[PDB]
Design a protein around this ligand. Structure first.
Ligand SMILES: CC(=O)[C@H]1CC[C@H]2[C@@H]3CCC4=CC(=O)CC[C@]4(C)[C@H]3CC[C@]12C
Lengths: 219, 218
């Protein structure tokens, strides 16, 4: 079906350029507009502009007249956004969204690319088992998880047992401490009966620092 | 330059009840060609937006029947009748009649439900973490409502201050509860100066405060 899959998280110094991509599939690419939407943390969506891939032509909204460009690679069905001379105001999530021109609305959206602009250097997390306390012998549900500690910038991606354990999982919003760095926890609930059955690995990816980590959580 | 206003910013509704987000506009959204190009998206926590309604009153494919939109000129309503747990999210109106297209500021739909008491857990710091030179203690409150919860730390039965952090999840998409983590962070040395670590939870669902604790080195 229609899929828009955008490139990963970016961390860039102020003044540098960024180029974000968005690969489309499952339809004639040249036949539909490509729109870009900005989303600052906890703020509303903003329509930046679109590129008409059939004419190669770009329109920008007032705020994004200036340091912003759209590019295409029709052969490879990818659209790009490039921001340059980056400011802190650009730290945000950027979305491409197919422009269904027959009713002047975007219909399919990419998953979002998160860009942090900072003078500071990527710092990768440490991961610690939050180890379950309920003895497998007794009943009820037992709780367990991973403490993903001391990283910059946002986001990190937590899954469990390589994304094949999703039920009962809570990954908390990241929070800051005085260190200037982020921490969070991902916890899961599981029948205490199964802690002595099968294993629990949490899989933490933090892409701006290129750390992929697996942690075996156990008694 | 048109303005696109949404009301409210925050709309609590209970399950099965109806919800009206409204969206005004500084100028008519009728095109000189006859159409109204007003649309709605829903953005669920973490996820990218979903197409709901196009041209004022049309469900996009797959969008359930209990969503409907209406209005004309400057005033539009989105009505979710018989509200459900997964309608939780932020709703935006989007106009593309006049250049340049704009979004409303969004309405956060919140589900109202009966009180539910937390499941409380506690995790001592890991050996691994200690080896590196700090202790973090974590206290988990699982599956509760309302958001409000007082979490207190007793270290050897002395109350703590401004050395822990709270994080709360967004409302759950199936049962509409919250989950919370409180994390006390001490230096390895500080941690070893003491023996009993406890988080005491106070909450509307609990008839009296529940305490979870451990003694060091278990
Ligand atoms: C006003 C006008 O001439 C029309 C002609 C084609 C239209 C565009 C077609 C593509 C499109 C898709 C969107 O999702 C936003 C609206 C837009 C960007 C439309 C806005 C109004 C346009 C620019």
């Amino acid at each position: 079906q229609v899929q828009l899959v955008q490139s990963g998280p970016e961390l860039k110094k102020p003044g540098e350029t960024v180029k974000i991509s968005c690969k489309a599939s499952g339809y004639m690419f040249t036949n539909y507009g490509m729109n870009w939407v900005k989303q600052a943390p906890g703020k509303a969506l903003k329509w930046m502009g679109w590129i008409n891939p059939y004419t190669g032509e770009s329109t920008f909204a007032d705020d994004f007249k200036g340091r912003f460009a759209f590019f295409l690679e029709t052969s490879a069905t990818t659209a790009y956004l490039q921001i340059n001379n980056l400011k802190n105001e650009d730290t945000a999530t950027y979305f491409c969204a197919r422009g269904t021109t027959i009713v002047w609305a975007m219909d399919y959206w990419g998953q979002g690319t998160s860009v942090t602009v900072s003078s500071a250097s990527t710092k990768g997390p440490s991961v610690f088992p939050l180890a379950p306390s309920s003895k497998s012998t007794s009943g009820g549900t037992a709780a367990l998880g991973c403490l993903v500690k001391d990283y910059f910038p946002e986001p990190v991606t937590v899954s469990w047992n390589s994304g094949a354990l999703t039920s009962g999982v809570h990954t908390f919003p990241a929070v800051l401490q005085s260190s200037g760095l982020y921490s969070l926890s991902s916890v899961v609930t599981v029948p205490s009966s199964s802690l002595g059955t099968q294993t629990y690995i949490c899989n933490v990816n933090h892409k701006p620092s290129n750390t992929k980590v697996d942690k075996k959580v156990e008694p | 330059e048109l303005v696109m206003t949404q009301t409210p910013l925050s709309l609590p509704v209970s399950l099965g009840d109806q919800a009206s987000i409204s969206c005004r506009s500084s100028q008519s959204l009728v095109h000189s060609n006859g159409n109204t190009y007003l649309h709605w998206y829903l953005q669920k926590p973490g996820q990218s937006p979903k197409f709901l309604i196009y041209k004022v009153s049309n469900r996009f494919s797959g969008v359930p029947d209990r969503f409907s939109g209406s209005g004309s000129g400057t005033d539009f309503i989105l009505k979710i009748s018989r509200v459900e747990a997964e309608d939780l999210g932020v709703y935006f109106c989007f106009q593309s009649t006049h250049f340049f297209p704009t979004f409303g500021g969004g309405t956060k739909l919140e589900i109202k439900r009966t009180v539910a008491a937390p499941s409380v857990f506690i995790f001592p710091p890991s050996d691994e973490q200690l080896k590196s030179g700090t202790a973090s203690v974590v206290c988990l409150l699982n599956n509760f409502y309302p958001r409000e919860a007082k979490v207190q730390w007793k270290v050897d039965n002395a109350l703590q201050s401004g050395n822990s952090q709270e994080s709360v999840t967004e409302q759950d998409s199936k049962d509409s509860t919250y989950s919370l983590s409180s994390t006390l962070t001490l230096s390895k040395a500080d941690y070893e100066k003491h023996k009993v670590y406890a988080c005491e939870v106070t909450h509307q669902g609990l008839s009296s405060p529940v305490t979870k604790s451990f003694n060091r080195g278990e």
